[model samples]
Target: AASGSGMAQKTWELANNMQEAQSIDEIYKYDKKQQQEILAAKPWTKDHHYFKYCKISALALLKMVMHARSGGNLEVMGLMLGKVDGETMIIMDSFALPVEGTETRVNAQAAAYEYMAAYIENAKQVGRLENAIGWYHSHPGYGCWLSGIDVSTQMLNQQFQEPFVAVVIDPTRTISAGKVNLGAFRTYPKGYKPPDKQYYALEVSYFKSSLDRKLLELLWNKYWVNTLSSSSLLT
Candidate 1:
């Protein structure tokens, strides 16, 4: 769960050739050598002093956390929607992948694709920050670390989406720590088998949240989905 800031009166004119998130996810490709050169430059990850970070609203943050909680002990997944400014990325919204079975690994079906396409399309029509930056998934009880499969997925996303990120949310630790447990990650330098064990996520910001007793429960499930739905109507 992540979101972004520095709200500007950003707008877009409708075009018939508009693209969708899932559609873009499926069709986009990247140059392997090009990425290697970029990685070696150590533009953002290596230059921490000048490196910028990520920003997300408190509401968008709650959405993925809630979605993961709803899945109980099973794993859940979704795509992160947002805009990128140079090395800084701002996550604005997330699309939850509807799943039916109980497995450590969750995969989206065709229907999930259809929904995400419509969702992305609607966001763009309304002029929201309708861009796909990365993806997110739940770890159930496990901590927030990329598994081998997740690493491979990240590599693919990096190849396809240069500014892409892999956000890992841990429902178990959130419950245990009594606070949110999430981590944003980026694959290590190119080459090395499966890359090195290092990954990165920029600084994060919270948009809104209240810690009141009854209010917390009420706002927990009521925030993100409704917020996204309302944004969908502006088109």
Candidate 2:
């Protein structure tokens, strides 16, 4: 299944930016009025599974992975900032929450509620104007599936937040598989259940602009030596 020539060509294309460049923050910046109109329409209420796809920027995914790894076996929580595009929700960035979690579960406290508002307000002051479209939390060694508590939490948020999503990440799985392990989901309405489906499934994808690729390349080189020299496996 592996084709070295095809892989080489794709790498060459990416290096020269010959491939179609992905958009980042352009929709929010250029088509603010239309995004606002989409929000005003309340399309999420029309269907339980209104959102079919989710896109997370490279920077946002990196931040989440670092945050999740930092928590080790414990669960870590965060919020995502972005806008909706058609049936897709785009996550431009993410920020950590002050919530506490043990190895079993994680939940936000009253203090975290205050911190979230303050953080979002501060982000606005700094020109990061995307709304908090969803929340993400780590599953550590567990796979990327919602727990019972997560379902209830998402249901409450869906009622109030309107267009919210739940993203679960497994840092342990990510490290073992050499790739990110995550899932995006939305809960069905209360007292309503599908014939077989429990939650609305969303297809997730990662994307980055040319700028992200440039910066990440530098970061990779800087960290490459550290990976070779460090003894994480030994220690």
Candidate 3:
């Protein structure tokens, strides 16, 4: 028997109001032609092999960027984790802007730590989702890539578990004629040897349409149902 299962769900949607607001703000202002051109110019599929268990999906990366762009301040990213086929790890779902905070231009470290703590506790109570897998945040105007402060945050991520993944989204990557790049990092255990570089890079592309609602429903069926089962066990 398969101990774990797979979930194909639409984890996010662009609300009607959000669509109208983006239209007015020109938030959907990326040059698709240029984006495709850059993507065509280079090979796809880059790997960051630092973490053993963490896998940052393309959709998850996009959600982080969208959250930051939607609100300039701090968009707290959230995740749902589950075992797929017993051993494989899946970052089942992700979303942002859960906390009530004004948009401020602060360093990624502060936002990252705050969001992690908030989500972890919330998941425990509401969803029974354990483990702090990884996180993502945006850099407005600044170039893409992890900063020294980001590295410091990864060190903090290490306190949670192995294979700590951190993502950095650069909004400016789409400014000129470059592809939007999402950088990934993995932290190893103490005394564990790491490669010369601690991070990897992935060129992220966006989907014009929102994720399918059916997919979202299915994910809830798979994940939330399981979480509810665990909650019943304790009660």
Candidate 4:
């Protein structure tokens, strides 16, 4: 059953051209392998079984950036639900705060599990919407690539019978100057074989105003060294 709130679905347009290379020669080395992985995972249909959406706040974004800059750690907690269509995913409609003093890298795994428990609880409040889809988090400095920890998490996700998706975000990469680097992965059952294409990534650029566009460009040029570099703002 739908909420029937009738909240108009806003056009979720991603910003374009946000990354900048330090030099022309460096630009020539840009790779599309990750982009191909992301696109291949896209255009998901309702019959696909599950879907996800990220609802981030400005404060949360800032906290993530700060943690990345400090090499500290952070965890995002939210609910995942099945998609009614290609463009939308229904969330369980709840939120939770991370535990106090759990901001170090060593405690990151604990933080993640805590968030997951909260997420599942919220989902239960909504009648425990079946088939949990996946989970996502911000990478701070590292680009959208999965680190060792990420792969480990995916392995844990494989414990479920249904497929699970992993969405990773790098706030430091801007897409409009051509710097968006977003990555997604899917984990399936033991005997499951993914399609020829199993992973996907993209460089998305989005802006709400020309001023935002200019600011993003300036930041991209000033901070990032390349599309994949972990700079002060992102690492």
Please write out the lDDT profile of model 1 over residues 1-235, one tens digit for every residue: 2231111100110111212233113221324465455546646544432324665544456568777877778778888876554455657667675544434333532333344446556657687645777778888877888886677667656655556778888866321113467778777545545432545555654332232223433544354334344453322
**What are the per-residue Cα lDDT tens digits for candidate 4 across 22-108?**
221222122356434433655442233233332222222223333343343444433233322222222221223343233522456
Worst lDDT 10-window in candidate 1: 6-15
* Stretch of 10 with least lDDT, candidate 4: 3-12
TM-score ranking of the models = 2, 1, 3, 4
Model 3 per-residue lDDT tens digits across residues 1-235: 1122222122222210112122113322335565445335422122234223333333454445456555554433444342221112335345663654423214455555656666676777677566555566666666556766566666666554333456666554242212445555554333444444444443222232244234534543444344445443323
What TM-score does candidate 3 reach? Answer: 0.47
Model 4 Cα displacement at 52 (Å)? 14
- Candidate 1 segments exceeding 4 Å error: 1-52, 99-129, 173-178, 192-198, 209-235
1 or 4: which has the higher TM-score? 1
List the pairs of residues colliding in candidate 2. none
lDDT of 4: 0.39
Which segments of model 2 are wrong by more than 4 Å? 1-20, 24-36, 102-130, 173-177, 196-198, 214-235
Q: Put down candidate 2 lDDT per residue, 118-235, tens digits, no spaces.
A: 6666766688465888889888877888777778777766776657789899867322114567899988887776564447679887777667676555544333333335435422
Task: Pick the winner on TM-score between candidates 1 and 3.
Answer: 1
The lDDT-based order of candidates, best leading, equals: 2, 1, 3, 4
Q: Pick the winner on lDDT between candidates 1 and 4.
A: 1
**Number of the top lDDT candidate:** 2
Task: Compute the lDDT of residue 95 as modeled in candidate 3.
Answer: 66
Evaluate model 2: give its lDDT: 0.67
